[PDB]
């Protein structure tokens, strides 16, 4: 099938397991991804990047389009869901989703309140791909294939500042990330 995505230990990513998503570029490239809030629309929570490269953020879990495939592979539509350790600030879902166009900034933001499964027109905004980013990590790509007769955006995901926070949005140059096992996943390779 398609080539598996690898984590920072060299292990193939497993669907249903927790991974931190951490910038492959540290320093001013920042740390990991997490749920954030906008003052003007506190729910759903938005996707933000921690500024500290020592802060891995909140892990995500990946859900394959083909639920029978245990491995997360490049160029395959999947759903992405934050699994917060903390209490719920919002009752919307923590599944990533592309927002409606933001006229005040010109951006298509990554936000949450996405849906898991049910591939097709209704869930089009909830399907992401992971692609290789040259020789350094992986980039997220919004280019869903789940609806043949749907017109869709087809763009890499970059990072962009907004209102003092680092957000993710569609762009020309995708930002590179690596995947680090969370503690729950480390248990899956040890007896
Ligand atoms: Zn292929
Ligand atoms: Zn190995
Ligand atoms: Zn392996
Ligand atoms: Zn922090
Ligand atoms: Zn299969
Ligand atoms: Zn919205
Ligand atoms: Zn706006
Ligand atoms: Zn603004
Ligand atoms: Zn704003
Ligand atoms: Zn186990």
TrEMBL record:
Disulfide pairings: 43-90, 143-154, 147-150
Keyword Cytoplasm assigned: no
Residues at which Zn(2+) 6 binds: 113
Annotated Zn(2+) 1 binding sites: 3
Keywords: Metal-binding, Signal, Zinc
A single GO molecular function term of this UniProt record: endopeptidase inhibitor activity
Residues the record lists as binding Zn(2+) 3: 40
Domain of life (superkingdom): Eukaryota
Binding of Zn(2+) 5, residues: 102, 104
Keyword NAD: no
Binding-site list for Zn(2+) 7: 162-163
InterPro entries, sorted: Kunitz_inhibitor_STI-like_sf (IPR011065), Prot_inh_Kunz-lg (IPR002160)
Residues that bind Zn(2+) 2: 11-12
Pfam families: Kunitz_legume
Binding site for Zn(2+) 4: 99
Family per record: Belongs to the protease inhibitor I3 (leguminous Kunitz-type inhibitor) family.
Protein name: 21 kDa seed protein-like
Organism: Durio zibethinus
Encoding gene (name): LOC111287662
């Amino acid at each position: 099938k398609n080539e598996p995505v690898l984590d920072t230990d060299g292990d193939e990513l497993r669907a249903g397991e927790q991974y931190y998503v951490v910038s492959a570029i540290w320093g001013a490239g920042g740390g990991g991804l997490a749920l954030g809030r906008l003052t003007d629309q506190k729910c759903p929570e938005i996707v933000v990047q921690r500024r500290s490269d020592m802060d891995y953020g909140t892990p995500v879990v990946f859900y394959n389009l083909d639920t029978k495939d245990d491995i997360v592979r490049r160029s395959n539509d999947l759903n992405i869901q934050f699994v917060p350790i903390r209490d719920k600030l919002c009752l919307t879902s923590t599944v990533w989703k592309i927002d409606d166009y933001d006229t005040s900034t010109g951006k298509w933001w990554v936000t949450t309140d996405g849906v898991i499964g049910n591939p097709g027109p209704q869930t089009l905004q909830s399907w992401f791909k992971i692609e290789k980013s040259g020789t350094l990590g992986y980039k997220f790509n919004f280019c869903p294939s789940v609806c043949e007769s749907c017109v869709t955006l087809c763009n890499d995901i970059g990072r962009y500042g907004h209102d003092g926070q680092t957000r993710l949005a569609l762009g020309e140059n995708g930002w590179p990330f690596v995947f680090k096992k969370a503690s729950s996943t480390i248990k899956q390779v040890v007896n």
